[PDB]
Amino acid sequence: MTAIANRYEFVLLFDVENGNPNGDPDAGNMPRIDPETGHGLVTDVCLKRKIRNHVALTKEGAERFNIYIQEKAILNETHERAYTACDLKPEPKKLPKKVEDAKRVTDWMCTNFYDIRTFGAVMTTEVNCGQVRGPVQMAFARSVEPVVPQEVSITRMAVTTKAEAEDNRTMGRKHIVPYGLYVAHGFISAPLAEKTGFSDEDLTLFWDALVNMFEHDRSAARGLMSSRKLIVFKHQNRLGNAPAHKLFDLVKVSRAEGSSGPARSFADYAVTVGQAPEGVEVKEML
Amino acid sequence: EVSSKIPKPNPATAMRDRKPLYFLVDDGSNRQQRAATLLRNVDYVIEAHFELTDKAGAEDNAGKHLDIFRRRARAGQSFQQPCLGCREFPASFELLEGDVPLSCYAGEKRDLGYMLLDIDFERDMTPLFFKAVMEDGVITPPSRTSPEVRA
């Protein structure tokens, strides 16, 4: 697998209208917010799952493009598949003693499964396949302005089993963010790609997934989510020639002249990108 | 703490060649760890007097040395800082012009068993002991110069 030969950094801008970009499991289902400033948050795992879903949809389980975590599968069975394909006994809870075979099993896992090859995975279980760090990493998405989550009451004209009034025989709850423009940062590391085999075709498919991430993620509670801007910084050498924080500071978001009241559309924000350093090429056509 | 004392060198051979003299505290058996169980927040009052020795000067008089000691104690002067046994335990000292303050063991008669009285340097550094009984919190050792306590 001819791994990529350049270090990348990208910034993704997406917004939600009357939707719930990511619920909070331990606080009802409210959208995640910063507990001190109120800015909305979307966990990296959510975006990674959306990318996984897009890859699965657009590849339909083709060769070398399977997905490891998938949906209600048993991972130990996947590890057993990997061991069988390598002619090894998975009986021990440890990795095979011979380093060559311990590398062979993990290489098979990386080659077969796209999300392992891209984001990495931990496979230390009863049947062990090692660890992969993942060439592609992305941090939490954070709204540019504070959001005010809204709880919407909804009723139902039907009952599941039996009601006590046999009146609000059913009352539900819907959480929505009236609007919020989120900014997601991400990094791609060439050495890790060389270790796992993350190639250029994988990078192109990843860009496609980022651009069309939400077009097939529609749901009753998602609302209208869309990808607005994707700026990709490509370094001229393997290790890069500019700090990450310097590049991300080139992408700036501001209200422009629509300061009247709360933001309610992408037209209320203005995005500008500066000139990249000498050794970095910035492509924004995505 | 350290295992052994530093040995006597011969200075002459010290630079018959460049001879680096040193003691490696951390090297092997040189490092000896010694646990100490020690007292805390002590307080004593010492009653002592004087005695002229054979090599006393023709003009030396007990009164003169007594007054010198009293002046030094009153002013806090000292040849060296006194310590409670070991040098890392300095002693704060005063002269008691008034009465000795009341003791904590005022109503006790505690037996402390035999304990060192002094070391007789005339009879080849021979230690001599006495049965120490703490009556009323005050210990009255026998005179260490007497002949019936010395062998």
Binding site: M30, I33, P35, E36, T37, G38, P146, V148, P149, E151 | -
Partner: protein, 117 residues
């Protein structure tokens, strides 16, 4: 008692205001599954200046629903609100951790007082 109506500390007053708003909503709309403290506590303590205005709108609606009935407490809660917001020059954009703790202390102090028979 424990409640101190003379504190006049902005976090404390905001906590008291939140407690009285929750009590007003509970009285106006009995049987609701979730109260204000269950819904807007996170947002209220995060950025009070962004959500307290709508909390006050809802409280006004709730007091309106109570004043109509001949049993009129509504007026009592409204006067409490007048007094509490009287001592506030402006809502805080953000509240520090200790300030949030004081906010919760004030909320719990006010809530117990309104539960007195």
């Amino acid at each position: 008692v424990s409640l101190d109506p003379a504190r006049t500390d902005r976090p404390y007053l905001l906590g008291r205001l939140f407690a009285v708003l929750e009590k007003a909503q509970e009285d106006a709309v009995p049987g609701a599954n979730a109260t204000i403290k269950d819904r807007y506590l996170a947002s209220a303590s995060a950025n009070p200046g962004q959500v307290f205005h709508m909390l006050l709108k809802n409280a006004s609606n709730h007091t309106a629903k109570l004043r109509k009935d001949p049993e009129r407490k509504a007026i009592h809660y409204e006067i409490m609100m007048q007094e509490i917001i009287d001592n506030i020059s402006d809502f805080p954009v953000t509240m520090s951790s200790d300030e949030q703790g004081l906010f919760m202390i004030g909320y719990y102090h006010q809530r117990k007082a309104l539960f007195t028979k």
